[PDB]
From a paper:
The epidermal growth factor receptor (EGFR) is a receptor tyrosine kinase that couples the binding of extracellular ligands, such as EGF and transforming growth factor-α (TGF-α), to the initiation of intracellular signaling pathways. The extracellular module of EGFR consists of four domains, denoted Domains I, II, III, and IV. Domain II, which bridges the ligand-binding domains, contains the ‘dimerization arm’, a loop that mediates the principal interaction with the other subunit in an activated dimer. Domains I, II, and III form a compact unit that we refer to as the ligand-binding ‘head’, and Domain IV forms a rigid and elongated ‘leg’ that connects the ligand-binding head to the single transmembrane helix.
To better understand the origin of this apparent structural heterogeneity, we used 3D classification to further partition the entire dataset of 765,883 particles into 10 subclasses. The resulting structures for different subclasses differ from one another in the extent of a ‘scissor-like’ rotation between the two ligand-binding heads of the dimeric extracellular module. When the rotational angle between the two heads is at its largest value (~25o), the two legs adopt similar conformations, and the membrane-proximal tips of the two legs are juxtaposed, with a separation of ~5 Å between the Cαatoms of the last residue in the legs (Thr 614) (the ‘juxtaposed’ conformation). When the transmembrane helices are in the N-terminal dimer configuration, this linker favors a connection to the tips-separated conformation of the extracellular module, and when the transmembrane helices are in the C-terminal dimer configuration, a connection to the tips-juxtaposed conformation of the extracellular module is indicated. For the tips-juxtaposed conformation, the reconstructions for the EGFR:EGF and EGFR:TGF-α complexes are similar, with near-symmetrical densities for the Domain IV legs in both complexes. The only noticeable difference is that the cryo-EM density at the very end of the Domain IV legs in the EGFR:TGF-α complex is slightly weaker than the corresponding density in the EGFR:EGF complex. Cryo-EM densities for the Domain IV legs in the juxtaposed conformation is similarly defined in all three complexes (EGFR(WT):TGF-α, EGFR(WT):EGF, and EGFR(L834R):EGF).
Numbering used by the authors:
A (entry chain B), C (entry chain A): 1 to 614
B (entry chain D), D (entry chain C): 5 to 51
């Protein structure tokens, strides 16, 4: 069976996004054809005559549901079955319908949520809707759980008389509107004494499974309308089946033939490639407090550490930086020496001009070098501002991985927008494990559409969005192309140390035209297209090559003396040996090193005793 | 509209509003910026 | 019934334990006052006019039930509710009634198992019971699981026919004999399509939980008659509640306030003190080969092996050693470098004489020194034979722990019966973590009573059964009472090296009366009731104390060079200190060598800077 | 009774016997020894 289409949902509570039609276009552009909102559902500032019929598809919301400040007459949320309530509005509410009138005290009228049957966690708040019809009759006992029946705030005041009665066919007049299709379907309070949860009837043969959230169409666990905690292949589980089962007979643990990894609210066959795999059989985002993320054995793992594990910082939006929205000038200290951000990174224009609202001073551009030790982000990277004097993302030169576990808007994992930089300069970036890439709006940066991003993309379905940066020929005319010392693979900047691969060879972190063979100041050799210096004790060969390796063992001829296989500067004269006996040697004719006479303690300048006048 | 402590509340040149119905403060974001304080660019649509 | 009285259950398939009245007593001593047979239930060779009325208390057999070769009329197994079938008879059957007739064709007549409603695994077999009647009428489809409904082998013949038909209030005429309660109680095949497991009535409001095994008195998991897999102190669970719970919203693991450790078929709050604890929270007996057990914080965990982790050899009766029953000469080789036996140890008289029926050559007595490297046994140690020329248990000399995870008869973890040995000789045994001790029947064994076995035990409730050895008055009558140079704590032999503790002081392993502080051998110093020699550089004196500690910081006489805060035979001649040079130390008249300038780095055998020449 | 293929099957002086009904071979242990072939001493009764 096919997945349900998901949408991210908004998180801007009462904020208006432009005019009344700029706002409605964003609401429409987001929740069109959606069927499962992963975040919140916020319907605000919708004016009359607007057609909200694209909301007829949403079936469950994982956050809250806020309906405020509207003036439209009817909001057709008539397929919503569940509000999971994983996030509250005003700390207590998983459904708030507030102040839906215009100046004339005539606003929202028809909210026919005729399929809304359960609100997992949270209360409900209704207030100040002077034209709302047929909702004060609802019995909210069947919907919201009994733990929260005390935190509810229902204020109903129409008392104008623009409503019609409820079709006399449902218990106690409880109706969601007018019609034989539009009244409350009770599934919890009409249960028999033995039904553990929801029940599709009053007879004791109608109890649903203990994991059906809204209701059911059968007694089993594959007959739920919507699962309550976890979701197996087609059944509703309480917990994902463990990978290993205990054997009460042999007092050991046996492999489970259908053990699944718990990932999010589903049981999968195997964790996603970029997620950490614990031993409980669960895909997580960060190893435990006493564990550090162990290397890839094909997959990520958590290994226990001895004493201090390491220095790893929490990114923005997690841990102590839960409500900070940028890299303040006050929190920047806490990223002092950590080489792996365990979260996100936002750099917004607020950091650089300060924020008086949260009492934050302006950030100092020279302090951004604190991030030069970072080598791995496990979330995303969002750079919206950079100091204008700088012409490169200098703080992120040592960055190598972006894991992309949490993405921006749920899609992007690297975003560089509206900056003054001339080149990106992430010269050591190697991989982007998940999420898209947007680099657009930078009026000068053009060293950006040369990289082969498909090399960095760890998975499939990743794309790059690089538009309206600079010219693509206006900096190829002024010469802002890469150095001819770079492979056609790509280039991060104008230097030769800013290429993906080299044309000929390389001197460490920089590309060159040829190794220093034959001539040059330091003698070198070639292996894997790298230039390594010969041991200082290798004689500068003006004819052929000089050496065939790093060690003095590969020299063509030595510079001073020769102690056997090795090329030494001066023959040993005090080196520890066997039986605690010292070692003294001498240089003969061919500058060869030979051992002294055992007796010669103060060393010797010749063979045997005649050689050392002691 | 909104008092002295809420100057510089809306980022990216948004304008702060007072909602006398609810007694709250909200931002009227410019086109292209999202979030509660207009802090985020809308990367999913038009740069 | 806060706890059900358990018994171990026999394992004698068709063996007869002596005369017909000696067999009946073993059956009567094993199963008297039992309610849960932890093993098998075998009722064989029960003759006519014998009282089997002690069987009416059994409620659950965890293995198989074998009823064969009896000639008694009525076997009253009325309370038997379930046969878990953890072990089959003939690889197939969890219940077997076979050939219950004597020569006169008379025999079994009444088998009133009215409460037998479930057989979790295995089939049923009936054969050659030419007097058993009113049992072919049962419908075994309700009892035996549908997976094994094909292996069943049921053939009945009652040519005699001396009994009556079934009471009218019997379902389809199916009765367990004459009577109204003797009718069969159907709980699986009569019920509606809602009930997945068992049930109580034909109505779909009568389905039992899927964890109840026989039946139920309610719809909750807390209303089962017997549990199907596990038992959380009041409720039948599928698996024990985990210790950590996944969180689909933060993608991290959280502590479970109601997490239990699984220990057999029960979920407990903490593992026994001598069991291993895994990270799943499960009490195991010996964890996987990829890991190795280790003590930590009072409990016994096990960490991952690093390359070559030590050898842990299997025990008799587990793994590749299930066929075997002793250390027969075939498998003695597999125990070479073992420092722990994960399992048991059975040394039986059939090892030293060789078994034809299994083709094992007679073991060579000297071949037992291989066991002188074993240092602990996680199961038990059972010794029934030992070479006749020996005096003590020499092969088990470095044994230190007997954890007693699995025991013999479920009771004894150290059993040394009917040996010609003179002294025990286990002069390393420090703990017997569980199980009783029996050291009885040894024809001439002294010293076995001087040990207070309370000090060795680790759990309260462990007895000892040291009975009928060499007489305690006939031990001292020939001087066979251990040395007076030892504390009144015990002794495993006549030598001073066999005492548990001493009266004055110990010297490495042997206990002496003083650490020769004044005369004789190289004098030492006392610490922690030992004798420890100070390094022989410490010049000895024959007048009073000669040293205080190991190092030279506290000696009194130092004939060697007293190089300041220490002593040494010869002061250093270039030891690696600072300045990256051979740190020299010239010769002194007061044995206190000092350092000279870097100029004389040859031997600087003179004091001062200008005073070292060549 | 039982053939020479079963010599020494019953340990501790037990006598091997044939069960013509079930067509199998079993032991008759002496008093004090238990097990399928009389291999174990009965510890919890009479030492």
């Amino acid at each position: 069976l096919e997945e349900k289409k998901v949408c991210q949902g908004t998180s801007n509570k009462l904020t208006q996004l432009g005019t009344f039609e700029d706002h409605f276009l964003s609401l429409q552009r987001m929740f069109n054809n959606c069927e499962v909102v992963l975040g919140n559902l916020e319907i605000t500032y919708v004016q009359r005559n607007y057609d909200l019929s694209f909301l007829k598809t949403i079936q469950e919301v994982a956050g809250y549901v806020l309906i405020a400040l509207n003036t439209v007459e009817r909001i057709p949320l008539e397929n919503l079955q569940i509000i999971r309530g994983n996030m509250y509005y005003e700390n207590s509410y998983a459904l708030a319908v507030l102040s839906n009138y215009d100046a004339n005290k005539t606003g929202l009228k028809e909210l026919p949520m005729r399929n809304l049957q359960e609100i997992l966690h949270g209360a409900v708040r209704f207030s100040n809707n002077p034209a709302l019809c047929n909702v004060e009759s609802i019995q909210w006992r069947d919907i919201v759980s009994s733990d929260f029946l005390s935190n509810m705030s229902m204020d109903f005041q129409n008392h104008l008389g623009s409503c019609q009665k409820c079709d006399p066919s449902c218990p106690n007049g409880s109706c969601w509107g007018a019609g034989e299709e539009n009244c409350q379907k009770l599934t919890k309070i009409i249960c028999a004494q033995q039904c553990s949860g929801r029940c599709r009837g009053k007879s004791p043969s109608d109890c649903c499974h203990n994991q059906c959230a809204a209701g059911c169409t059968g007694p089993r666990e594959s007959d739920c309308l919507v699962c309550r905690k976890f979701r197996n292949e087609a059944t509703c589980k309480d917990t994902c089946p463990p990978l290993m089962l205990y054997n009460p007979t042999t007092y050991q643990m046996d492999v489970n033939p259908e053990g699944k990894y718990s990932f999010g609210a589903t049981c999968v066959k195997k964790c996603p490639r970029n997620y950490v795999v614990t031993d409980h059989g669960s895909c997580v985002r960060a190893c435990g407090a006493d564990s550090y993320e162990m290397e890839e054995d094909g997959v990520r793992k958590c290994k226990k550490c001895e004493g201090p594990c390491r220095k790893v910082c929490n990114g923005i939006g997690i841990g102590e930086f839960k409500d900070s929205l940028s890299i303040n000038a006050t929190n920047i200290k806490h990223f002092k020496n950590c080489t792996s951000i365990s979260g996100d990174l936002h750099i917004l224009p607020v950091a650089f001009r300060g924020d008086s609202f949260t009492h934050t001073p302006p950030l100092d551009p020279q302090e951004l070098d604190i991030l030069k030790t970072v080598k791995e982000i496990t979330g995303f990277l969002l750079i919206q501002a950079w100091p204008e004097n700088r012409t490169d993302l200098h703080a992120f030169e040592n960055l190598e991985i972006i894991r992309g576990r949490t993405k921006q808007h749920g899609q992007f994992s690297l975003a560089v927008v509206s900056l003054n930089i001339t080149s990106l300069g992430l010269r050591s970036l190697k991989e982007i494990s998940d999420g898209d890439v947007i680099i657009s709006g930078n009026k000068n940066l053009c060293y950006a559409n040369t990289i082969n991003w498909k090399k960095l993309f760890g998975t499939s379905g990743q794309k790059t969005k690089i538009i309206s940066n600079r010219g693509e020929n206006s900096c190829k005319a002024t010469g802002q192309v890469c150095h001819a010392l770079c492979s056609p693979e790509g280039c991060w900047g104008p230097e030769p140390r800013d290429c993906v691969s080299c044309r000929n060879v390389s001197r460490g972190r920089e590309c060159v035209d040829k190794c220093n063979l034959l001539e040059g100041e330091p003698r070198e050799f070639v292996e894997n297209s790298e230039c390594i210096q010969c041991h200082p004790e290798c004689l500068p060969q003006a004819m052929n090559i000089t050496c065939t390796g790093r060690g003095p063992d590969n020299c063509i001829q030595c510079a001073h003396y020769i102690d056997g296989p090795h090329c030494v500067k001066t023959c040993p004269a005090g080196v520890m040996g066997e039986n605690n006996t010292l070692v003294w040697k001498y240089a003969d004719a061919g500058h060869v090193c030979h051992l002294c006479h055992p007796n010669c303690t103060y060393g010797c300048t010749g063979p045997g005793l005649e050689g050392c006048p002691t | 509209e909104c008092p002295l402590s809420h100057d510089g509340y809306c980022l990216h040149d948004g304008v702060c509003m007072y909602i006398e119905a609810l007694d709250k403060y909200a931002c009227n974001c410019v086109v292209g910026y999202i979030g509660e304080r207009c802090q985020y660019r809308d990367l999913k649509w038009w740069e």
